[PDB]
Amino acid sequence: IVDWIDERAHVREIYRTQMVEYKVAKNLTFPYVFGILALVTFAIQIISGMVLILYYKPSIADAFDSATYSIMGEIPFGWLFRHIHATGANFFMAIVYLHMFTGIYYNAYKRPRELVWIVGWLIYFVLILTALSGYLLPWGQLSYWGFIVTTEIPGSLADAPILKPIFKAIAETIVLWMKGGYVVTDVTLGRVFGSHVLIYPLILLALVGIHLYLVRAAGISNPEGIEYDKKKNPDKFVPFHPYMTLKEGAYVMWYLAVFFFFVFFHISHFLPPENFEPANPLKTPAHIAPEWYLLGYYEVFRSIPSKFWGFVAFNALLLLLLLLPFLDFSPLKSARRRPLFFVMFVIFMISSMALTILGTMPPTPQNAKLGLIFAALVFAFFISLPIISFIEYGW
Amino acid sequence: IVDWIDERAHVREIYRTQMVEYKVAKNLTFPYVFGILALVTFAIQIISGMVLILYYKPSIADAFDSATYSIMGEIPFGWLFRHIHATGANFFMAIVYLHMFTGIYYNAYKRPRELVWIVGWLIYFVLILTALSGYLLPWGQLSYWGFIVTTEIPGSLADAPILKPIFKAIAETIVLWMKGGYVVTDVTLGRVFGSHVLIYPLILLALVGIHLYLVRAAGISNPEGIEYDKKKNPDKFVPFHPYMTLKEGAYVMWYLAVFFFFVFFHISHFLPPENFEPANPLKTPAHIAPEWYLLGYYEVFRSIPSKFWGFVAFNALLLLLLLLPFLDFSPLKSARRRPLFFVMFVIFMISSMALTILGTMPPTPQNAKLGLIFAALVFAFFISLPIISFIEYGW
Amino acid sequence: FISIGIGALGAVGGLGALYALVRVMLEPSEIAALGAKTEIDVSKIQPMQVRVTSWKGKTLFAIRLPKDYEILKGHDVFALVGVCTHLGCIPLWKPVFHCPCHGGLYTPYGDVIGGPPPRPLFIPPQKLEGNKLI
Amino acid sequence: FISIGIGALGAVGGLGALYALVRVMLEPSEIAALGAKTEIDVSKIQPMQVRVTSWKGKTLFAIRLPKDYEILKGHDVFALVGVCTHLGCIPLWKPVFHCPCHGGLYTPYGDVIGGPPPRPLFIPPQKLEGNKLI
Amino acid sequence: TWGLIKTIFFAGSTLVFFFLLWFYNPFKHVEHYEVDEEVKAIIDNPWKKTESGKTIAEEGRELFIASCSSCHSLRYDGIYIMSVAANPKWKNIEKTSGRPVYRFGTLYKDRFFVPKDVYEAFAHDDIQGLKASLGQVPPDLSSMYLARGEGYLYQFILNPQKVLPGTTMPQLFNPQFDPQAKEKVAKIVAYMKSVNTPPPKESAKRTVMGVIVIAYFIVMGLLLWKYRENLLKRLG
Amino acid sequence: TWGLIKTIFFAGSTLVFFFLLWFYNPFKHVEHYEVDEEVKAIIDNPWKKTESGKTIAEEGRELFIASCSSCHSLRYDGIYIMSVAANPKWKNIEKTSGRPVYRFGTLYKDRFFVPKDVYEAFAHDDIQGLKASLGQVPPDLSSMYLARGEGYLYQFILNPQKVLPGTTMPQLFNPQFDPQAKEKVAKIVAYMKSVNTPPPKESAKRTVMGVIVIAYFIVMGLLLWKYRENLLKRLG
Ligand SMILES: CCCCCC/C=C/CCCCCCCCCC(=O)O[C@H](COC(=O)CCCCCCCCCCCCCCC)COP(=O)(O)OC[C@@H](O)CO
Ligand SMILES: CCCCCC/C=C/CCCCCCCCCC(=O)O[C@H](COC(=O)CCCCCCCCCCCCCCC)COP(=O)(O)OC[C@@H](O)CO
Ligand SMILES: CCCCCC/C=C\CCCCCCCCCC(=O)O[C@H](COC(=O)CCCCCCCCCCCCCCC)COP(=O)(O)OC[C@@H](O)CO
Ligand SMILES: C/C(=C/CC/C(C)=C/CC1=CC(=O)c2ccccc2C1=O)CC/C=C(\C)CC/C=C(/C)CC/C=C(\C)CCC[C@H](C)CCCC(C)C
Ligand SMILES: C/C(=C/CC/C(C)=C/CC1=CC(=O)c2ccccc2C1=O)CC/C=C(\C)CC/C=C(/C)CC/C=C(\C)CCC[C@H](C)CCCC(C)C
Ligand code: HEC
Ligand code: HEC
Ligand code: HEM
Ligand code: HEM
Ligand code: HEM
Ligand code: HEM
Ligand code: FES
Ligand code: FES
């Protein structure tokens, strides 16, 4: 029964405290589902990678003979669990982008949520590495070369800068770090496999746990902006169960329907067809831009004429998210409450979608001009947050 | 500083509640360290397996060429992190045996700790599989054959029993389950590698977390036996920090010293020398008994003349630990309080050490007689717990 | 009704997901049984000639002899797991047949006549269906 | 003092453990630089003859010619990364040297004279130490 | 309301972003090759029976092993270079694993799959006149269908000089005075498609189960929604 | 006290259990072979210099490649069968990875390590007279030292008929009228030891760091103990 487990585990005292008397806000909108959806996609990736690790082999002469021959034809339902994996990777990138952007919107990074945003940025940085190093593994014609392209980006740092041209042969993230040093060999493939498969998901679970605890410790920020009305204002909370637990439970099922649509009926873009060719280190494909979640940065890169300054802009665009809680400082919180932050956020969103879309097209001079025009608008959102902050402080 | 992190994460409110005002018992003895030591050894195994997964290769033609050539000679400090791994596996078996046996001693399985013992038995069962499937991986001369010996044990079940001899070709844990079916091939090695390396440690972390929560939910059982004196009896708790947190912190360091002794100076029994020969499926080694943590059961096996009944005894000796909380029922708890349970526990401990020690010697008829005499004493401890329980109920 | 319809639906979904997971991970189905049939036509082997095959693993012999351990009496067709005993070499046919690694000799029925190996070759099970050995 | 001695000792232990972990995982040290020296004695290559080698990966040529893109002027000894351009074949020496996959021709200095490839072979860096090319 | 404008903007932009990011990016100018439409039914159903009791896939397999296995080694089906015939062992190809080709979902005990490193060391490292004469090894036609497409595979074969400017692969099926080559190339492409595409029994089970899974999750979501709506009425 | 009897019983039994379970189980009767004591210094220090500027390990390597590489393929050092010489490529052994033998902690660019499946398919599957005549392939002497021991390796070589009753491996160094064979076999075993045992520089760094780690953890434990003792006095 349940009373026997109740007396020994206190299951009902945990249930009545975590669900029935939690008292989340009532006016929670739809983009407050993206965290639960990212957690569900993380679970999907773990469950479907536990199946792939049984048959994938981190050898150069055996990779792409496991993931393409064994996984796809030899193993029952192996096609399905590679489809689920390669679809959930892209869905997990997209849901995390939506989550962090509609957390930027409601400004869920202000007091006292400065630390949850730092842990979330660590989540994002290590997720980039988990989805970047897991793409070399199929060892396809463009997988190898998109790993090479992405691992030579830290090499433009060593190129002679405008100032102090001693950066040559220093911070060698090429030789020491990934690409293994002058050759991508079997040892490097095994190292990337092991890291991607067990070192990164463990520090993903740890950081997701810390993040979920820090969300509860600071409380869900309501989208209105008053951020609380303590000891008063009832009839606007309608506690967690069953108001929210069944709304999220329906959004999760509908999201899984949209997910298993791509898994079954349209995967010709998650398993790209010209990646089904075994990689040879002598023939370079034509269009070898990195994966879609890194194209918004790859367009800021290789658009500035200097490569060192392009890499510096690449890194500044990623560092301006750690400082983003420390960068915007105002008593006002939401975007329903800041009419000047809404226009900057829409500029940021549009000009950040446009960068990822320009990152797919071939590098023409007009494409470079457009990617620079949009990079200027992306940087404007960060170099104007303190201005709007200083304006709103004077009301 | 710390106040900034305090305001956003509530770190001091967690510290003052989990350490300074926890109020564990004062008379806790030494064998109450084995849980923390098993947790530390679990951490050691995870940390040192994250390094081994980078270079181990789950192919028949490449296994034992990674773990013996690459890991040991080619990789810097790879000798050290294979030494730490193969030593921590045996230390993790030994510490878990000590923990569960000195938890049997103080009867930490009675009310209300029935569920923590079930979760601990699940820990033990899945730990057997994690240390059993991780031993096939080096693909050594005796690793392959000790996997074969252990995976043919469920095959004696299919042998014609005394009753209902239809068990032939049913419950085929040989073909369907491990050994892959009639051949240990490259696919089976890859499957065992993937399972051992990521599927078993994940359900180890989950079960260890559930176990650690269930220990707190039921409270540490004090070794005396009164099990509490609620709302009274002060000056005998001296709360968790710094009374216990620094006693455990010193025992952990001394245990790690004893550990890194074996890691560096005596490992000729954790990496057995005749396992440094590449496995061939045509030549069987002389003495191919399973690993030491399964020898207490392997001696109950292959000592009874019947193989089916030997396997049934193997399984009953393992099932009589799940029922052990439901098997012993008495108001008295400790072994300092039950003078009749102490003698049965010492019989159990001695006759269970003797079984693992007899499991190493070759199978002579005198060895079989001794392993049966000791198997009788091991079963006596389980078929007498209800008798002592019924006697003590009448006081 | 809904509060039980969703329970039944979730149970069916969990059952299907567990079926898929079992079928991927824990199933060597229909490829592990290689081979339990092992078609070996008897009318192809000549007298005093041995055909090398594989049953339940490697390796297996197919011995045929016209006249005459000794588990079975005269059947003239059988199969023995052909791998030497004490160190695991492969004996060569030809009338006894030995292995040249250490000098172990074997009679066509399995027993040893000059034995470096301690024990003979264990007879694997067999079935007779017309002119096909299992 | 103890409450700071244990802190210093734990910090040293953590530093050593992190050093070991870095040295195992994140270090292709002293084996990735294969090869930055690439001893290529100039007095061994004959005029109008190409030696196949490997610098910073595969592959590399070692061309020597007595007389005469064109990044460098007349030095008579240099090295070009030898792999065809538009599809990545290996050109064969012999005076131009071409690759027979598609028909791409190359002058000994890298440029193309009949080009299926769009661009010539990029010159990798080089150093001159007596009679040894890098 | 203004919230509605916010909704159909912040959702419309994301939908039209993921649309042209995940399918039909209209700004990439990758070219398209198509089957000649002369037959276009030899390739649609390679498992379609024909006369002499042979399907089109089996006949394409024989055409490939007879006219194409002299330089190309289509593994995943046990086809290797005919020099020597067969290029794998000779003697014991079984002692390699080396396993018999077990595709979806039926195995073929008469053909074996040899790893990429065992092969090309036993076979092509005692090098025959392929890398020498041609210049490049005819790479592999195992997963070339999934990587090129039926259109590119058909338009490449029977006219390699048009798709690639210069290529030492011959015409080898010359049209415009041999009217029997187009269907041969179609059978070859249909065979190469039958190696990487599920049969009509398997490609249908996947469709049925993918429809059932989506119809399962949608119904489960709407059932949970209706359950929440009903439970919020007993309370308020 | 009675608690003391409980302590030195429940700890004594566990200690004497793990003793004869983890080192020197006195009830296992595995036999022991020992070096002939004729030299016993050729094998102790294989890196010990000799005349002609050659160490004993290098001379054992030459003796092995000259008299033993005709049937045994000691990989992990680049030694393969001399038929053909060398049995690996011939031509491109570099295009296999195939990497140069990089043991602890110095690499040898003149010898290459070829995987187990690439080798024995290029080399022994164009089978020469080893599996035919002998009956079994001379397995491998790469990690035979770690698996047998110096005693077993010495007593096996120069008298294989004594360790194993019948073995087609010859004496190949016959004593009792050739007094120059014992030191040759000792040099061979010393070479085979130098492939799997760290040099005197590396086997010493491991000892020093293993002493320092234990002395670190013991001191840390006793420091934490003294800190707890001191902190329990400020409170009680
Ligand atoms: C068969 C089926 C096919 C399926 C096709 C694929 C599926 C597509 C579905 C995706 C739909 C996403 C919906 C998100 C929007 C939710 C609704 C909304 O409108 O979200 C708004 C803000 O959310 C927010 O920022 C979040 C929205 C902004 C996020 C921008 C995402 C950019 C994506 C990545 C960009 C690359 C980044 C590069 C690195 C810098 C809410 O603003 P409010 O002022 O509170 O309005 C209140 C009203 O809603 C009242 O009801
Ligand atoms: C260089 C250095 C070399 C190192 C060599 C290796 C290291 C060895 C160290 C191991 C020492 C273990 C110490 C355990 C004993 C702790 C002390 C003790 O005595 O533990 C007793 C009970 O613990 C208990 O059951 C626990 C003891 C019983 C556990 C039995 C373990 C059996 C092992 C596995 C058996 C195989 C099982 C097969 C499957 C059935 C405590 O009983 P009390 O009545 O409360 O006494 C109170 C007094 O102590 C007051 O102070
Ligand atoms: C997926 C399969 C499941 C199995 C997974 C196993 C793991 C965990 C099991 C699941 C957890 C069980 C749920 C227990 C929740 C009950 C906690 C609780 O509710 O107890 C609270 C204590 O919390 C407290 O100390 C908080 C204690 C500190 C929490 C620290 C843990 C967070 C980090 C964990 C993530 C890993 C990373 C670790 C590295 C740092 C009491 O509340 P208070 O604030 O003190 O009182 C104030 C009142 O006004 C409100 O109540
Ligand atoms: C069954 C059905 C399989 C077909 C049924 C049979 C006859 C058809 C026969 C059949 C069809 C083939 O196409 C096939 C192909 C190749 C070889 C053989 C076959 C075959 O034999 C679909 C199974 C696939 C579904 C898509 C499972 C999803 C895969 C995992 C990633 C899910 C992991 C589930 C975990 C363990 C529970 C987590 C619960 C969490 C809270 C969410 C709850 C949502 C829901 C699970 C209730
Ligand atoms: C450094 C020293 C290395 C030698 C120093 C240098 C000059 C010597 C030079 C040197 C020596 C060689 O033998 C060597 C061999 C091969 C190639 C190269 C070399 C070499 O260059 C010893 C390092 C090994 C120790 C044993 C680390 C243990 C391995 C892991 C398993 C530990 C994981 C640590 C985690 C991340 C923290 C967890 C904290 C937890 C709460 C416990 C706290 C205890 C303590 C850590 C404070
Ligand atoms: C004269 C030897 C030879 C013959 C015979 C041959 N091939 Fe080729 N194949 C080649 C060469 C050379 C290339 C060029 C490789 C390249 O351009 O990268 C090639 C390339 C290809 C490609 C891939 C080209 C690309 O860029 O994707 C395909 C597909 C192909 N051939 C199909 C076939 C088929 C089908 C047959 C049998 C009907 C065949 N070939 C017969 C040698 C040959
Ligand atoms: C006549 C061919 C031949 C020669 C030459 C040869 N071996 Fe052997 N080796 C064999 C055979 C046959 C065996 C037997 C394998 C077995 O019994 O399992 C063997 C076995 C061995 C074994 C392992 C035996 C065991 O049971 O562990 C070692 C070690 C060994 N030989 C060492 C050497 C050394 C060192 C040399 C060179 C001085 C050498 N052999 C030369 C063929 C040869
Ligand atoms: C958590 C977020 C993760 C992301 C975003 C991610 C991403 C990816 C991607 C993009 C691929 C390429 C697949 C393809 O191109 O077909 C991949 C492959 C792979 N992933 Fe992950 N991964 C994640 C976690 C995991 C986990 C937890 C495992 C656990 C085993 C895992 C195991 C694997 C394996 C073995 C492969 C190679 C198999 C193959 O290529 O088919 N991954 N991953
Ligand atoms: C695996 C990845 C992630 C998981 C599982 C996850 C999970 C969650 C969940 C469940 C919530 C609460 C529900 C909600 O707010 O929708 C949340 C909140 C939050 N997350 Fe994440 N998240 C992830 C990634 C990220 C990233 C990458 C960032 C930032 C870069 C981030 C920043 C935040 C913030 C600021 C909040 C607070 C929302 C608020 O208070 O309104 N998260 N996260
Ligand atoms: C948690 C308890 C675990 C136990 C008791 C255990 C046990 C073992 C054992 C006995 C071996 C054989 C090593 C040898 O004989 O030299 C082994 C090897 C291995 N373990 Fe574990 N293991 C555990 C967890 C893990 C984890 C978490 C990982 C994560 C990567 C892992 C990865 C490996 C790998 C890759 C090998 C093969 C490497 C080699 O053989 O040198 N293990 N394990
Ligand atoms: C990875 C394996 C394990 C870990 C990390 C672990 C951890 C712990 C810890 C830290 C404690 C509290 C401290 C202590 O009692 O010493 C505990 C208590 C306990 N454990 Fe475990 N344990 C493990 C395995 C097991 C096993 C295999 C069993 C039983 C078969 C078990 C049964 C118990 C019981 C009954 C208690 C309660 C002790 C009491 O209340 O006095 N544990 N465990
Ligand atoms: S192998 Fe046949 S006698 Fe030892
Ligand atoms: S590959 Fe050299 S010409 Fe195309």
- Using DSSP's 3-state secondary structure scheme, residue B57 falls into coil
Beta-bridge mates of residue E55: E49
The domain of A214 spans: 1-395
Distance CA(B30)–CA(F186), nearest Å, equals: 52
Helix intervals (H) in chain F: 2-22, 56-67, 144-148, 150-156, 160-163, 182-194, 202-235
Residue B221 sits in a domain whose CATH number is 1.20.810.10
What is the DSSP code (8-state) at residue C37? S
Distance, CA of A158 to CA of E176 (rounded, Å):
58
Mutate to test the interface with E, among C9, C12, C39 (most CBs of E within 10 A): C9
**CB A153 within 8 Å of CB A311:** yes
What CATH code would you report for F27-207? Answer: 1.10.760
Rounded CA gap, F222 and F220, in Å? 6
**CA dist B200 → A39, B34, E94, E217 (Å):** 21, 22, 33, 29
Give the DSSP letter of residue B140.
Answer: B
Is C62 in a helix, a strand, or coil? strand
Q: At what angle do helices C5-25 and A34-52 cross, to 10 degrees?
A: 30
State the Cα torsion E72-E78-E83-E86 to the nearest 10°.
Answer: -170
Residue C93 domain-assigned?
A: yes
Rounded Cα distance between C130 and C77, Å, is: 12
Q: How many helices (H) and strands (E) does chain B have?
A: 16, 0
Looking at beta carbons, which residues of chain B come within 8 Å of A191? 54-55
Q: Are A75 and A67 in contact (CB under 8 A)?
A: no
Is E28-206 a domain of CATH 2.40.50?
no
Please, which chains are in contact with F (at least 3 CB pairs closer than 8 A)? A, B, C, D, E
Are B357 and F17 within 8 A, CB to CB? Answer: yes
CA distance E162 to E180: 20
What would the two tokens of residue C17 be?
A: 């997901």
Q: Are chains C and D in touch, 3+ Cβ pairs below 8 Å?
A: no
- C-alpha distances (whole Å) from E57 to each of B134, C134, E81, E188 are 44, 33, 20, 8
> For residue D99, what are the β-bridge partners?
D104
For chain F, the straight-line distance linking the first and the last C-alpha, in angstroms and rounded, comes to 27
Nearest in space to B385 (alpha carbons), one of B347, B341, B346, B352:
B341
Question: Cα separation of C134 and D62, whole Å?
Answer: 63
d(C-alpha B356, C-alpha F17), whole Å: 9
C-alpha span between B255 and B119 (Å, rounded): 25
Question: What gap in Å lies between CA A310 and CA B170, rounded to an integer?
Answer: 66
Task: Tell if the CB–CB gap between D5 and F223 is shorter than 8 Å.
Answer: yes
Cβ–Cβ contacts within 10 Å for residue B30, how many?
12
Q: Strand pairing partners for C104?
A: C99
Task: Read off the tokens for E187.
Answer: 């059978």
Q: In what order do the strands lie in the sheet with C60-64?
A: C49-53, C60-64, C77-78
- Ligand 6 neighbourhood includes E171 CB (under 6 angstroms): no
What three-state secondary structure class fits E212? helix
Cα D100–D101–D102 angle (5° rounding)?
95
Backbone angles phi, psi at E109, to 5 degrees: -70, -10
Check whether C101 is labelled as a binding-site residue: no
Residue F137 φ/ψ, nearest 5 degrees: -70, 130
**Would C32 be classed as within a structural domain?**
no
Cα dihedral sign, E64-E70-E72-E78: positive
Contact A76 C23 (CB under 8 A): yes
E167 vs D89: CB contact, 8 Å cut-off? no
Taking alpha carbons only, the member of F34, A244, C76, B51 closest to residue E224 is A244
Of the candidates A356, A347, A364, A387, the residue with the CA atom closest to the CA atom of residue A104: A347
Calpha distance A369→A304 (Å, rounded): 9
Residue C62 structural domain? 40-133
Buried-exposed string F128-160: b where 16+ CB fall within 10 A, e elsewhere? eebeeebbbbbebbbbbbbbbbbbbbbbbbbbb
D10 shares contact with chain F (CB less than 8 Å)? yes
C75 in a known ligand binding site: no
Handedness of CA C69, C74, C79, C83 (dihedral sign): positive
Which residues contact residue B376 at a Cβ distance below 8 angstroms, ignoring those fewer than 6 apart? none
Kindly tell me whether chain F and chain E come into contact, counting contact as 3+ Cβ pairs under 8 Å: yes
Count of residues in chain D: 134
Of E136, E149, E236, which is closest to residue E192 (Cα–Cα)? E149
Nearest to F56 by CA among F196, F192, F201, F172: F192
Task: Phi first, then psi: give them for residue C108, nearest 5 degrees.
Answer: -55, -10
Question: B88 Cβ partners below 8 Å, 6+ apart?
Answer: B41, B44, B45, B48, B259
Query: What are the tokens at D36?
Result: 């930055």
Let me know how many helices (H) and strands (E) chain E has, helices first. 7, 2
User: What sign does the dihedral B4-B7-B11-B13 (CA atoms) show?
Assistant: positive
Which of A133, A179, A183 to substitute to test the interface with D, most D CBs within 10 Å? A183
Determine whether the interchain pair B60/E99 forms a contact, defined as Cβ–Cβ distance below 8 Å. Answer: no
DSSP letter, residue B278? B
Secondary structure of chain A in HEC code, one letter for each residue: CCHHHHHHHCHHHHHHHHHHCCCCCCCCCHHHHHHHHHHHHHHHHHHHHHHHCCCCCCCCCCCCCHHHHHHHHHCCCHHHHHHHHHHHHHHHHHHHHHHHHHHHHCCCCCCCCHHHHHHHHHHHHHHHHHHHHCCCCCCEHHHHHHHHHHHHHHHCCCCCCCCCCCCCCCCCCCCCCCCCCCCCCHHHHHHHHHHHHHHHHHHHHHHHHHHHHHHHHHCCCCCCCCCCCCCCCCCCCCCHHHHCHHHHHHHHHHHHHHHHHHHHHCCCCCCCHHHCCECCCCCCCCCCCCCHHHHHHHHHCCCCCCHHHHHHHHHHHHHCCCCHHHHCCCCCCCCCCCHHHHHHHHHHHHHHHHHHHHCCCCCCHHHHHHHHHHHHHHHHHHHCHHHHHHHHHCC
Helices F182-194 and F56-67, axial angle in degrees (round to 10): 110
- In order, the DSSP letters of B307-341 are HHHHHHHHHHHHHTTTSHHHH---S---SSS-HHH
User: Residue D75: which CATH number?
Assistant: 2.102.10.10
Q: Do B51 and D23 touch (CB under 8 A)?
A: no
Contact of C118 with B314, CB cutoff 8 Å: no
Q: Is E71 within any annotated ligand binding site?
A: no
Helix (H, G, I), strand (E, B) or coil at B217: helix
Q: Is A66 in contact with A55 (CB distance < 8 Å)?
A: yes
Residues of F in contact with E121 (CB under 8 A): 96, 118, 121-122
Instruction: Name the C residues in 71-130 with CB < 8 Å from any F CB.
Output: 87, 89-90, 92, 99-103, 116
Cβ neighbors of F117 (< 8 A, separation 6 or more) are B61, B62, E96, E115, E117, E118
Please give the Cα distance from B297 to B312 (Å, whole number).
11
- Name the residue facing A176 among D28, D57, D90 (closest C-beta): D28
- How far apart CA B356 and CA F20 sit, in angstroms, is 11
DSSP chain D: --TTHHHHHHHHHHHHHHHHHHHHHS--TTTS-TTSS--EEGGGSPTTEEEEE-SSSS-EEEEE-S-----S-S-SEE----S-SSS---PBP---EEETTTTEEE-TTS--SS-SSSS-PPPPP--EETTEE-
User: Smallest CA–CA separation between E112 and chain F, in Å?
Assistant: 16
E strand residue ranges, chain B = none
Q: Which long-range contacts does B28-34 make (Cβ < 8 Å, 24+ apart)?
A: B28/B220, B28/B222, B28/B223, B28/B244, B29/B223, B30/B251, B31/B98, B31/B99, B31/B102, B31/B105, B32/B220, B32/B223, B33/B247, B33/B248, B33/B251, B33/B252, B33/B255, B34/B95, B34/B96, B34/B98, B34/B99, B34/B102
Q: How many structural domains is chain B composed of?
A: 1
Report the gap between the CA of F147 and the closest CA in chain C (Å). 16
Query: What letter represents residue A232's amino acid?
Result: K
Q: Cα–chain-centroid distance for residue A131?
A: 9
Find the residue in E nearest to B187 (Cα): E97
CA proximity to A239, closest of A15, A69, A2: A15
Backbone angles phi, psi at E103, to 5 degrees: -85, -165
At which residue do the structure tokens 């390739």 appear? E43
Q: Is residue D122 part of a domain?
A: yes
Which ranges of F47-125 does DSSP label H, i.e. alpha helix? 56-67
Strands F107-112 and D49-53, bridge-based pairing: unpaired
Residue D90's closest chain A neighbor by CA? A282
Which 3 state secondary structure label does DSSP give C49? strand
Please judge whether D116 and E168 are an interchain contact, meaning their C-beta atoms are less than 8 angstroms apart.
no
Tokens of F14: 């566990």
Distance from C-alpha of A204 to C-alpha of A207, rounded to nearest angstrom: 5
- Residues from chain C contacting residue F168 (CB–CB below 8 Å): 100-102
Q: Which residues of F touch C89 (CB under 8 A)?
A: 135-136
Short-list F120, F148, B370, A185, CA closest to D54: A185
* B and C touching (3 or more beta-carbon pairs closer than 8 Å): yes
The CA distance from C69 to C75, in Å, is: 15
The identity of residue B289, as a single letter, is: A
CA–CA distance, E229 with E227 (Å, rounded to integer): 5
CB of residue E25 inside a 6 A radius of ligand 6: no
Using CB atoms, which residue from B181, B280, B282 is nearest to C32? Answer: B181
A139-A144-A150-A156 Cα dihedral, nearest 10 degrees: 150
Domain count for chain C? 1
Is the CB of residue C39 less than 8 Å from the CB of residue B262?
no
Taking alpha carbons only, the member of A58, A200, A197, A180 closest to residue D26 is A180
Q: Is E109 helix (H, G, I), strand (E, B) or coil?
A: strand
Resolution to 1 decimal place, in Å: 3.3
E136 is in an annotated binding site: yes
Pocket of ligand 2 (CB under 6 A): B 29-31, 97-98, 101-102, 105, 223, 258, 261, 296, 336, 349, 352-353, 356; F 3, 6-7, 10-11, 14-15, 17-18
CA distance A363 to A289: 10
Residue A385's CB is within 10 A of a number of other CB atoms, namely 20
- Cα(E14)–Cα(E103) distance, integer angstroms: 40
What is d(CA D85, CA D115) in angstroms, rounded to the nearest whole number? 10
Is F135–C116 a contact, with Cβ atoms under 8 angstroms apart?
A: no
Domain boundaries, chain F: 1-26, 27-207, 208-236
Chain D, nearest residue to E167 by Cα: D102
Nearest-by-Cβ selection for C6 from E102, E107, E224: E224
Nearest to D32 among A175, A195, A281 (CB): A175
| Integer Rg of chain D from CA | 23
Contacts of E214 (CB under 8 A, 6+ apart): A257, A260, A261, A264
Count CB-CB contacts under 10 A for residue A1.
Answer: 5
Beta bridge partners of B195: none
